[PDB]
């Protein structure tokens, strides 16, 4: 319930930002591109291009940043455990 009054944010894929001001330019995914504002809590730097960021759903404004995809085929092979085979 605490984090029920919290939030969702549709992830987004940044096409790129612009200057003399910010307004970051973005294509979400199943939808499309929106040139939209970014969260107040994130500088104009910690948001490089090609960065799957999270987007205030309705307001459609950068809410928070994130990290990169790796698919579920590369992570499925990271060993987790370890094979008992000493020298």
């Amino acid at each position: 319930q605490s984090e029920q009054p919290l939030q969702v944010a549709r992830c987004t894929k940044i096409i790129n930002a612009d200057s003399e001001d910010p307004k970051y330019i973005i294509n979400v995914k199943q939808f499309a591109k929106f040139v939209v504002d970014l969260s107040d809590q994130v500088a104009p730097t910690d948001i490089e291009e090609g960065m799957r960021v999270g987007v205030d759903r309705n307001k459609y404004q950068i809410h928070i940043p994130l990290p990169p995809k790796i698919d579920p085929t590369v992570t499925m092979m990271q060993v987790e455990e370890k094979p008992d085979v000493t020298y």
Partner: protein, 73 residues
């Protein structure tokens, strides 16, 4: 084919946008920029000339090419 701001409600174009250009493509740029000078190499000087001679020159010298009536490779 020209990016446009369109007020969501209105579909009234607000701003013109720069232009399309693949996030997969942009990764083709070069910020770090190598640091290999030439002396790093060795024995390749024949073509190293050519290497230079096919880009640098034609780039930093396009007025010399026509002054001999040619075209650059």
């Amino acid at each position: 084919g020209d990016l446009v701001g369109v007020n969501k409600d209105s579909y009234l174009i607000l701003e013109t946008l720069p232009t399309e250009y693949d996030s997969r493509v942009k990764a083709m740029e070069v910020d770090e920029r190598p640091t290999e000078q030439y002396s790093d190499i060795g024995g390749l000087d024949k073509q190293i000339q050519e290497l230079v001679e096919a880009i640098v020159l034609p780039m930093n010298h396009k007025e010399k090419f026509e002054n001999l009536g040619i075209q650059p490779p």
